[PDB]
Amino acid sequence: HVSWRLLDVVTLELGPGGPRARTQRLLRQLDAPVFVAYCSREEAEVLFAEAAQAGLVGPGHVWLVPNLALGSTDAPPATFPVGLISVVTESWRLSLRQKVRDGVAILALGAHSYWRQHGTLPAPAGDCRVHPGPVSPAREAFYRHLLNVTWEGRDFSFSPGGYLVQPTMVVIALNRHRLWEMVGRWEHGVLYMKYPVWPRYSASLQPVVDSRHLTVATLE
Amino acid sequence: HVSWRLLDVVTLELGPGGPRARTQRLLRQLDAPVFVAYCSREEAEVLFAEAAQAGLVGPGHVWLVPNLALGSTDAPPATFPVGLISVVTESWRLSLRQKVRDGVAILALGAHSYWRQHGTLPAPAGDCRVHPGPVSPAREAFYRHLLNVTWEGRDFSFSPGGYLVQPTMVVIALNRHRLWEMVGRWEHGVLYMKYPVWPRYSDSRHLTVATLE
Amino acid sequence: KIVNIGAVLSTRKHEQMFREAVNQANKRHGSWKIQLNATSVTHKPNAIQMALSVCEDLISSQVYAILVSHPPTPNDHFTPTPVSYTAGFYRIPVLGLTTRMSIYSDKSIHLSFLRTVPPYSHQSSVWFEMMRVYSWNHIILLVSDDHEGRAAQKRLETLLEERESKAEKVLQFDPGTKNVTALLMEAKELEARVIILSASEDDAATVYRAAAMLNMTGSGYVWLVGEREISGNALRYAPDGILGLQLINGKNESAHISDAVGVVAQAVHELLEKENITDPPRGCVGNTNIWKTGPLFKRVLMSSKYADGVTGRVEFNEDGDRKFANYSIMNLQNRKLVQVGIYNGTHVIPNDRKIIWPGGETEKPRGYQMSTRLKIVTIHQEPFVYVKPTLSDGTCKEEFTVNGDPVKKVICTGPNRHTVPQCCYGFCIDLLIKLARTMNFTYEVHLVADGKFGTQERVNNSNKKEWNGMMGELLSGQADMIVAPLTINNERAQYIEFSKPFKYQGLTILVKKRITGINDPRLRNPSDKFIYATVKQSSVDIYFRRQVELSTMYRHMEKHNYESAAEAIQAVRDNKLHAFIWDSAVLEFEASQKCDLVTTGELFFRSGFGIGMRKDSPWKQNVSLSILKSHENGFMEDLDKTWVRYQE
Ligand SMILES: *[C@@H]1O[C@H](CO)[C@@H](O)[C@H](O)[C@H]1NC(C)=O
Ligand SMILES: *[C@@H]1O[C@H](CO)[C@@H](O)[C@H](O)[C@H]1NC(C)=O
Ligand SMILES: *[C@@H]1O[C@H](CO)[C@@H](O)[C@H](O)[C@H]1NC(C)=O
Ligand SMILES: *[C@@H]1O[C@H](CO)[C@@H](O)[C@H](O)[C@H]1NC(C)=O
């Protein structure tokens, strides 16, 4: 609904080798309270270091990145601004063993759901050396029945492309003590937040408060 | 007394062609029928060049700048908009000999105006090597009397700030000849206009409309 | 690479200190990537010769910066100009170790100039901070006609206007003057009592002597001065407890040299990595050019900070200011100065003993010494303020009422030419009686000198607009309160402040027994059948003028209207006027009182009544509280039924 007045889009060579002076000049000329960035982890560290050099990381601006950057999720490196916002899927804090338990469960339910339909488990087709096989209808039907699954109150529905559709993403942000923490959930297209206003921190912490913002009380 | 509803004010930073990106974005989102600019002659060639790429030199738009820019009035440069209004002091077309004669005449007119008082013909200071002049003697009357002396029916009242107060000034513009021409004087505080309607000579705008009774 | 820097001093002993400082700075970075040199030149009694000496020094090497200091000469004004002009011709950045003149901050005249000590005009921020901390709102500023004093007063006024508070009274005297008791007498007749002083030492001493002779240095007064007014012969005779300020380590002339050298070295270290090595100019005759990267070097040096300086962290403002240097509060404790607190321009921290005040009291004085004898202005309106002539005995005739109590009457003088005394009574007079009894003051009622309610207007051949009538009298200072049916509008609220409303009303139509609200074309378009009028120089005129869509109606009204009163009601009665527009209560009382008059329709634009008072007057809170408590008591209902409801 909102107009979403775009300000500027820029593409720069943030690779291991290149002219840093040109990128410094381009970053030095910008004016916008909100940034959205897309790059790789090494590109992310280079870009954030350069932004810290050219004073774009203070309490005035806000940065946003997708899940492609930020890497390990358990070891935030240096030069990562506090207040970084990303969006990751559910189960961003489970164990490796827990994830495999979900992986075997989804295969087991898929076979069981197909079992109720036809009472069988399709035979394997594993001749890597021979490499035979035209289009096969039995395996195709098994794969088609493998798409939708639901168990333990978690809806896994894969689109025709190999990605799941309608998940419950959780937004995360970098706390004041260099630690990822949850900020806001998302569940059937309605967003929630832990904070009614965005906490703004400073170089020496001591969260600053906007002078031209005020809270209004009332009732019905 | 007019309402004089202003649209916006923008402060640019234009110089060598290194930092010339934010200014283009600032000028791209500004629209007005009339602009008043303030920059030196060394920055006009940049600001008009940037404005010409953002659609700000069409006949529907007009400009107005002070006399600080356009230093070389004899040969106006390129990339300047056609029909830019500026204000210059009197005798803009006068010759150098005329200017020297006018200055000498003003100085000698002040000297003779004091001479009519039959007081003296004050002598200047000694030299530089002694650093003289600790106080101001009665010679300040010479400076005072050198203020309100006119010549050839031209007011030369000098303000205490060192600038003349109310000579006559004219308005000039660039016609379709790359040559400045007079438009109207401002004698006695009344504006004269040679053109009852602005010519607006030369996608577009400013379409003409007719109604009747 | 060899990097050369220059300096100019006059000690011939601190030059060795500068050499040691530059050597120590080169010890921080001496890997032959950048190598530092040093040059120095002494001052001369001749300014021109000093100029050619600076020329020779600049051509001596490829200088990149210039450092200048104050010699033992007593002419501290024009001392750094001969070097500054020649350096700025070539756009060579310079730094001033010790300088306080406020003429070098004009970047349009001095192209390249930096500084490491706060000039004299930046005290105003400290004064504003002190006023905010101590909560002193009504202040008086006395200054001189010099450029620095005018600039400081302008800065203080700009800060106050940003706070939207303004100054109570500003008075300035020409420099080098004596026997100036007239200005002090003029400033002594105001309620606000706090003095801000800024002048030379001799002027400060003369002002102190005049004030001591004028008794204005006693109790109840708190006057603060700057740093130049507490030195020399001025500090000899001065009232005790005078507040002041001083620099942290100013006039050292040696502590700032190390900081300047370090800053120059740090700037030139980063500058040398640029692609544009302009090779700063070497030449003084025939070189009619400028340094290609002079502005770049100036910008780089401006945005270069320091880690640990002797005078603290060093930064630069938009023009080269000291960037929050320290300041030390001072006092006058029995002919001896003393430190009372330390402030760095952002906050004050009292870390010393108690501070005494000119009257010798320990309690913190408050400004706005309140009076007790106010003048009151009013206007003649029928239901509210009745004007009657007095008897020969000196008292106007008594008039009892059916309730059993007499009507209160007061004596009002002023009305027209004449200034004869009369008697005033009615609604607003009773309200004034109760208000004065509650808030403990004395009144001297009078009338206006024009008859108009008051309307802002700008006369011809002028750019300033002055209020007329009662409103103009209030601002001019002739009246301290306005007890009259004065409506509250935005334009009025711009320049004064009202109390809470004590009566609500609006505008309606008076017609002698087709007329309706303002929608008929007979009213929208002029016609001889129906003629409407107002009272000019009033609020209704402004209301109908502040409407583009009603220009024709405004022109019709401006064709003819009354500068009058109930006389306009008579004009309606005499069939001369068709209908009248005015305040609701005024028309309604007369419509229900006499006979044969009826109000048409109902109110269409509503507004209230209020007492007028000067900007940020201290009387506002108590007036509002008393009015509210009289609303809720039921007293205003009794007053209403007595004066307005006893009809029909
Ligand atoms: C989708 O879910 C239904 C419900 O259990 C199941 O019967 C079906 O096999 C699944 N797959 C497809 C392709 O319908
Ligand atoms: C010009 O100024 C001088 C000041 O010395 C004064 O005496 C003289 O009357 C002035 N002339 C006019 C025409 O006002
Ligand atoms: C009124 O003033 C008198 C002295 O002038 C004082 O005695 C009395 O207490 C005061 N009353 C109030 C309510 O201020
Ligand atoms: C207002 O009333 C308070 C107490 O109610 C009193 O202290 C104060 O002096 C009054 N204000 C003025 C301006 O007299």
Side-chain angles (χ1 to χ4, degrees), chain A residues 2-4 6-7 9-12 15-19 21 23-24 26-27 29-30 32-41 44-52 54-66 69-92 94-95 98-101 103-111 113-115 118-120 122-126 128 130 132-134 136-138 141-144 146-151 153 156-165 167-174 177-180 182-205 207-219, chain B residues 9-12 14-19 21 23 32-38 40 44 46-49 51-52 54-55 58-60 62-63 65-66 69 71-73 75-78 80-81 83 86 88-89 91-92 95-96 103 105 108 110-111 113-114 117 119-120 122-126 128 130 132-134 136-138 141-142 148 153 157 159-162 167 170 173 183-184 189-190 192 195-197 199 202 204 206-213, chain C residues 2-3 6-8 10-11 21-22 25 30-31 38 40-42 45 47 51-53 55 58-61 63 65-72 74 79-84 86-89 93-96 98 101 104-105 108-110 112 115-122 124-127 134-136 140 142 149 151-152 165 167 170 175-177 179-180 182-183 187 192-194 198-200 204-206 210-212 215 217-221 225-226 231-232 234 238-239 241 244 250 254-255 258 260 262 265 267-268 280-281 283-286 288 291 293-295 303-304 307-312 314 320 325-326 328 335 338 340-342 344-346 348 350 356-360 365 367-368 371-381 383-392 394-396 398 400 404 406-415 419-443 445-449 451 453-456 467-472 474-488 490 492-509 511 517-518 521 526-527 530-545 551-552 554 556 560 562-566 568-573 575 579-587 589-592 595 597-599 601 603-619 621-636 639-644:
Chain A
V2 161
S3 98
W4 294 123
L6 203 142
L7 255 60
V9 308
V10 305
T11 77
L12 320 91
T23 73
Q24 163 66 257
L26 316 202
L27 271 293
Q29 45 94 23
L30 258 186
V34 155
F35 297 76
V36 162
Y38 161 82
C39 59
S40 159
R41 183 166 222 270
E45 83 186 330
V46 172
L47 164 142
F48 276 139
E50 179 77 29
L56 296 211
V57 195
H61 310 252
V62 169
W63 293 85
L64 294 131
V65 285
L70 77 86
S72 324
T73 279
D74 271 347
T79 168
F80 260 48
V82 52
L84 193 73
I85 302 185
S86 150
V87 53
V88 304
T89 182
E90 210 145 31
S91 85
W92 78 288
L94 300 197
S95 82
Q98 276 212 20
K99 288 179 178 179
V100 184
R101 209 76 261 165
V104 290
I106 193 192
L107 268 309
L109 221 53
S113 274
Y114 167 81
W115 189 102
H118 310 114
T120 167
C128 95
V130 196
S136 85
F142 172 51
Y143 160 73
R144 295 248 68 100
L146 193 39
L147 285 196
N148 76 44
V149 278
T150 168
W151 93 275
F156 299 86
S157 288
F158 290 129
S159 148
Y163 54 71
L164 68 166
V165 80
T168 69
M169 279 133 287
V170 289
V171 185
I172 74 181
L174 212 51
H177 313 137
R178 238 73 187 177
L179 213 70
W180 294 105
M182 164 164 309
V183 157
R185 197 186 315 293
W186 160 294
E187 192 295 345
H188 314 189
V190 284
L191 193 79
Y192 303 73
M193 311 275 278
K194 156 188 294 314
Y195 303 128
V197 290
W198 194 234
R200 285 260 188 88
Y201 288 103
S202 156
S204 87
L205 278 73
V208 308
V209 54
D210 202 351
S211 162
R212 306 207 84 63
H213 172 55
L214 39 68
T215 81
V216 170
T218 181
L219 48 73
Chain B
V9 56
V10 172
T11 42
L12 304 167
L14 82 173
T23 37
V34 152
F35 334 111
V36 167
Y38 213 140
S40 173
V46 179
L47 48 56
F48 288 121
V62 314
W63 292 71
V65 316
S72 297
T73 180
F80 260 25
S86 211
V88 283
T89 167
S91 85
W92 94 268
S95 57
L96 68 94
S113 155
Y114 192 28
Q117 271 284 339
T120 179
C128 308
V130 296
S136 298
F142 178 69
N148 51 332
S157 316
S159 79
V170 312
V183 161
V190 202
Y192 295 163
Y195 296 151
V197 188
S202 202
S204 159
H206 184 79
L207 48 76
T208 174
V209 171
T211 79
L212 85 164
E213 64 104 25
Chain C
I2 179 45
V3 156
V8 164
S10 159
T11 73
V22 55
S31 158
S40 153
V41 167
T42 178
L52 316 83
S53 306
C55 161
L58 78 74
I59 76 168
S60 92
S61 165
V63 200
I66 285 189
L67 261 63
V68 64
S69 279
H70 165 238
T79 281
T81 72
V83 51
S84 296
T86 71
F89 196 106
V94 311
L95 282 92
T98 87
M101 331 305 298
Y104 305 120
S105 279
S108 97
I109 319 196
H110 289 40
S112 37
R115 153 137 42 189
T116 166
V117 50
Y120 282 142
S121 295
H122 312 66
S124 44
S125 53
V126 152
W127 296 47
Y134 286 76
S135 75
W136 300 359
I140 307 93
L142 61 84
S165 287
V170 195
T177 318
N179 190 251
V180 290
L183 269 299
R193 311 191 125 98
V194 281
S198 75
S200 93
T206 318
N215 200 266
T217 69
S219 186
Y221 280 82
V225 309
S231 99
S254 286
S258 82
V268 76
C284 199
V285 202
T288 316
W291 164 9
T293 83
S303 173
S304 201
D308 194 3
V310 189
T311 48
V314 162
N326 252 359
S328 77
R335 274 294 308 111
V338 72
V340 191
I342 279 305
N344 59 26
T346 62
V348 80
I356 202 173
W357 270 288
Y368 82 109
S371 319
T372 179
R373 194 73 144 69
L374 308 98
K375 279 167 290 313
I376 275 172
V377 68
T378 178
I379 202 49
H380 172 31
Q381 276 291 353
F384 299 98
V385 172
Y386 289 112
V387 281
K388 281 309 191 314
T390 184
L391 308 190
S392 42
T395 298
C396 44
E398 295 178 351
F400 273 70
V407 300
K408 265 67 73 170
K409 299 200 206 270
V410 296
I411 289 94
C412 44
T413 85
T419 314
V420 300
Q422 312 189 356
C423 274
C424 282
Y425 69 101
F427 194 61
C428 276
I429 305 308
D430 206 331
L431 183 76
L432 167 59
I433 287 321
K434 186 51 166 323
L435 213 81
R437 144 182 324 148
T438 314
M439 298 194 333
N440 214 307
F441 62 83
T442 318
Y443 45 91
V445 191
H446 81 79
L447 260 65
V448 315
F453 265 87
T455 294
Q456 187 82 299
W467 294 85
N468 50 32
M470 211 155 57
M471 183 77 38
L474 175 52
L475 280 294
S476 313
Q478 274 295 62
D480 288 338
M481 201 155 258
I482 294 190
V483 181
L486 183 66
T487 171
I488 48 182
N490 189 290
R492 269 94 168 270
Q494 294 297 350
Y495 308 122
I496 64 173
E497 64 97 36
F498 303 95
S499 90
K500 282 295 152 47
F502 66 93
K503 201 79 199 322
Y504 318 103
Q505 64 162 26
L507 289 84
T508 204
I509 285 323
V511 56
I518 59 150
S527 197
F530 263 143
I531 290 307
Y532 59 84
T534 83
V535 183
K536 322 168 281 222
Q537 332 101 41
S538 52
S539 38
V540 184
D541 204 331
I542 290 302
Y543 182 42
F544 274 137
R545 161 132 32 80
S551 162
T552 88
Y554 181 39
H556 189 222
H560 52 289
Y562 309 98
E563 58 302 334
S564 85
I569 288 284
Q570 303 301 326
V572 152
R573 185 82 76 98
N575 276 339
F580 207 15
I581 67 196
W582 203 228
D583 289 331
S584 158
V586 170
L587 303 145
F589 158 80
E590 320 212 23
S592 166
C595 69
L597 296 168
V598 152
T599 43
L603 312 93
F604 60 95
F605 154 70
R606 318 172 58 89
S607 55
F609 274 155
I611 303 168
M613 258 175 318
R614 210 175 290 102
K615 270 263 272 204
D616 255 32
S617 307
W619 289 120
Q621 163 78 351
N622 312 47
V623 163
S624 285
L625 261 292
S626 164
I627 272 175
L628 281 174
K629 101 163 55 171
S630 95
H631 272 307
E632 311 177 341
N633 260 333
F635 164 82
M636 224 96 81
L639 195 62
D640 166 9
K641 75 162 42 181
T642 283
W643 285 108
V644 164

